[PDB]
Structure formats: C-alpha cells, structure tokens
UniProtKB/Swiss-Prot annotation:
It comes from Escherichia coli (strain K12). Once phosphorylated no longer has kinase activity. Disulfide bonds: none annotated. The active site is at residue 296. Forms a HipA(2)HipB(2) heterotetramer which can interact with a single operator on DNA. When 2 operators are present each HipB dimer contacts 1 HipA molecule, which are brought together by the DNA bend and dimerize, blocking the HipA active site and inactivating its toxic activity. Mutations present in allele hipA7 (G22S and D291A) decrease the affinity of HipA for HipB. GO terms for biological process: dormancy process; regulation of DNA-templated transcription; regulation of growth; response to antibiotic; single-species biofilm formation. This is Serine/threonine-protein kinase toxin HipA. Its EC number is 2.7.11.1. Keywords: Antibiotic resistance, ATP-binding, DNA-binding, Kinase, Nucleotide-binding, Phosphoprotein, Repressor, Serine/threonine-protein kinase, Toxin-antitoxin system, Transferase. It is an enzyme of class 2 (transferase). Belongs to the HipA Ser/Thr kinase family. Toxic component of a type II toxin-antitoxin (TA) system, first identified by mutations that increase production of persister cells, a fraction of cells that are phenotypic variants not killed by antibiotics, which lead to multidrug tolerance. Persistence may be ultimately due to global remodeling of the persister cell's ribosomes. Phosphorylates Glu-tRNA-ligase (AC P04805, gltX, on 'Ser-239') in vivo. Phosphorylation of GltX prevents it from being charged, leading to an increase in uncharged tRNA(Glu).
Length: 421
C-alpha cells in the first residue's frame, strides 16, 4: 500500500493508499533536511506531518489521463487493480510528467530500440455521442504516449528510464447531434500552431511530425527532461500543472466547470520568481489563443517548474490546437477556455472579442496597460509576416486545408488590431 517517491536519485517521501482507499503522503525526513529541498507540489508544502487532505489524491490523479475512457483502456492494458491513481500509478508511474518516480515498496538508462515495424505497432496500439459542447478534451478517447529518442532511433524506455518526447496521435472525429468536429488532422494542426507561436516569440517546445508505416504522429520535445553533456543520463525536472498547483482535481480543469481562469493564475504568477515576465507572457498567450481560435487552453495546459526551495516559474506553453480547421461548426461558436473578465461578465466568444476587451481585463488584473498595448501592437505588426514565414517552412505533405483555415481566420481577427495599432 506504499509507493516510495523519488525525484531522480533523491528519495522524497512516500504515497500510501490505506485499506479504505484514502491516499496520504509523507515527506522523508532526509529530504526535508536536503540542501535544496522543494515540495513535490506547491499544494503539498514541505512539512513533517502526514498529509491527508484531498490535495494528495488530486495531485497524483493529475499525473494520469483525466478521461475515464482512457483510464479503463489503461486499466485493461496493464490489468491494474483499479482505476484509482495508486493502482494505475503502480503500473505506469515510472515515467510521468515532471519528476515524480513511484516505486512499489515491494520491488538504469536502458531501452528497446524500435524498428520501423515495432514503432508502428507501438503507436497504432495507442490510437486504436456528444452535445452543444465544442471542447476538444472531454471524456474523449484521445491518448498520447511518449518515446525515448536515442541517436536516430525511437525507443521504448525500460525500467525507470525516462522518455524525451510526448507523442500525439490524431484525435479523429467528434460527433454531436447535427454535426461533427473533424479533428482527424490535429497532428498537423498542433505542429502548425507550435511553429506559429515560436515564430511570434512565444515560449513553446520544438516538435516534428513522425511517420511510421501508416501512422502520422506529432513528437513534441519534452521540457521536463534534460540530457547531461555526454547524453548518457536523462534527468527529470520537477513541474506541475495549474490544477496540481491549486490542489484541484482534473475534473475542474475547464473554467466553465469551476476551474481556474486568468484572474487566479495571474494572481498566482505574482509569486513567480520571474513574475514580471511570466505575467506578460501569460497575457500575451491569451491574445495569441484568441487570434488562433484556440479553444482548449484549460488549466492543465499551463505548468510551472518547481525549483530549489519551492521557487517556481512558468514552463513553456504546450498542447495548442486551433478550432479554425473545424469550421465548415460556426466561427461564432468558438469560445476561449478562459474568459476575459471585463465588468459586465466574462467574455469568451472569440468572434466577439476585440482589443478593448484585453485592455479592460488587463485593468482589472492590474496588468500595466502599457504592457497590454505593447502586446497588442506586436501582433498587429507581426502577424502577417509570421503567417507567411510559418507557411513557407511547412513540410511537403502538409494539408492545405489546415493552413488555409487557420491563416484566413487569424488574418480576419488581426484586422481588428491593425485598425487600432
């Protein structure tokens, strides 16, 4: 009933699942005495006592896919004891996001180099009614994996060996009453959004489209990993998402479900070690998501690195998908995951948002108006050249419809900035 918790080669504490199923956590006395001791989560501050709050269960549950559908698939794939975090983490808690390595109280750098055939088998095994909800991430079947890149080969790590890339497969088609959100090209969609963010100077990871037999996937370099100089040891870097940092369950990752939004995260970022820039980047990213029709910027898509002493700062942005390629669904149906608190009520309708809304929200959040104008002015001037630069760099087989759909819609919205800047 115990998973000993390690951050790379240092023993941090232990997660216990009691007979009644409660999850509790205790820090190791030696870790608490560690020179650069930091908490496993900002929701689990360093303390000597046994921690029994729900933040324990929620933190570890947040390390697993939040979709019940995927969980069952995982439960069956490894024959876990239950859908509970402890039982699923007892099987796959060796390599997750951040630096939490869990080892059953019971029981490196090794891997299996995959061949063209093995790669396809491995990836194909992960790929294979709705409502007036246009959210991409619901009780969906979308399940991403991870691989270890060694030299010029993709590999499956063995033991506690980490991975270097998050692998994402096509989302497929989400069907509702009288329509269907065609997300069969989400791999190319995300690749393009990541290139665009990068071109605009936003902090995001590099990614490449990988092709194995009949599989077309996105390999996103992980920023919660770092190789030593000899490329012989891959270390994990502590990080957690906004649900974890606030001690919330993944159930509330969307603001529309009671989750955190811009105001809570902005307040929390005042405590960042680089508060000034993190708040600026976070606000700049809200304008970016508006421009690109990104409707899935929920709380689990923003994370912080936990640094020595509990110090923290924003990680790069990630999991960016535009809803524009879905239109065919109306533009007026697109809503941001986190609304702009104006005064008369949060605004989420992308087609109804203009620069005045960002300035108004900035004012309420005490985000310097001069900074907001700087952000808006930058996109006013750079968007067109950025789109053209990104387009020119796309691969030979990139889907034209995706480019066209995103370009045209960004340009339409950019018109509202160029009119004021």
């Amino acid at each position: 009933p115990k998973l000993v918790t390690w951050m790379n080669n240092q023993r941090v504490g232990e997660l216990t699942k009691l007979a009644n199923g409660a999850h509790t956590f205790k820090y190791a006395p030696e870790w608490l005495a560690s020179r650069y001791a930091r908490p496993l989560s900002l929701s689990l501050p360093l303390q000597r006592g046994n921690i029994t709050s729900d933040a324990v269960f929620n933190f570890f549950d947040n390390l697993l896919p939040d979709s019940p559908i995927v969980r069952d698939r995982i439960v069956k794939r490894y024959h876990a004891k239950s859908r509970q975090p402890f039982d699923l983490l007892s099987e796959i808690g060796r390599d997750s996001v951040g630096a939490v390595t869990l080892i059953p109280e019971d029981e490196i750098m090794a891997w299996e180099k995959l061949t063209e055939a093995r790669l396809e088998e491995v990836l194909t095994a992960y790929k294979a009614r709705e409502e007036n909800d246009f959210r991409i991430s619901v009780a969906g079947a979308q399940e991403k994996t991870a691989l270890l890149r060694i030299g010029n080969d993709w590999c499956i790590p063995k033991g506690i060996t980490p991975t270097t890339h998050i692998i994402k497969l096509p989302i497929g088609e989400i069907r509702q009453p009288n329509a269907t959100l065609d997300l069969s090209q989400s791999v190319d969609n995300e690749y393009y959004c990541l290139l665009l963010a990068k071109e605009l100077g936003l902090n995001v990871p590099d990614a490449e489209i990988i092709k194995a037999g009949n599989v077309r996937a996105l390999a996103v370099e992980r920023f919660d990993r770092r190789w030593n100089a000899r490329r012989t040891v891959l270390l994990r870097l502590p990080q957690e998402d906004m649900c974890q940092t606030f001690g919330l369950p993944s159930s509330v990752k969307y603001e529309s479900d009671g989750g955190p939004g811009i105001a809570r995260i902005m307040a929390f970022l005042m405590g960042s070690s680089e508060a000034l820039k993190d708040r600026y980047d976070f606000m700049k990213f809200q304008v970016f998501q508006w421009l690109i029709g990104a409707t899935d910027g929920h709380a689990k898509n923003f994370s912080v690195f936990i640094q020595a002493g509990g110090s923290y700062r924003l990680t790069p942005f990630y999991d960016i998908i535009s809803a524009f390629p879905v239109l065919g669904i109306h533009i007026s149906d697109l809503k941001l995951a986190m609304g702009l608190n104006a005064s008369k009520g949060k605004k989420t309708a992308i087609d109804k948002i203009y620069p005045r809304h960002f300035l108004a929200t900035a004012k309420v959040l005490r985000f310097p108006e001069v900074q907001m104008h700087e952000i808006l002015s930058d996109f006013a001037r750079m968007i067109p050249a950025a789109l053209d630069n990104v387009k020119t760099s796309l691969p030979t087989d990139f889907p034209e419809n995706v480019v066209t759909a995103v370009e045209s819609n960004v340009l339409r919205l950019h018109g509202r900035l160029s009119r004021e800047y």
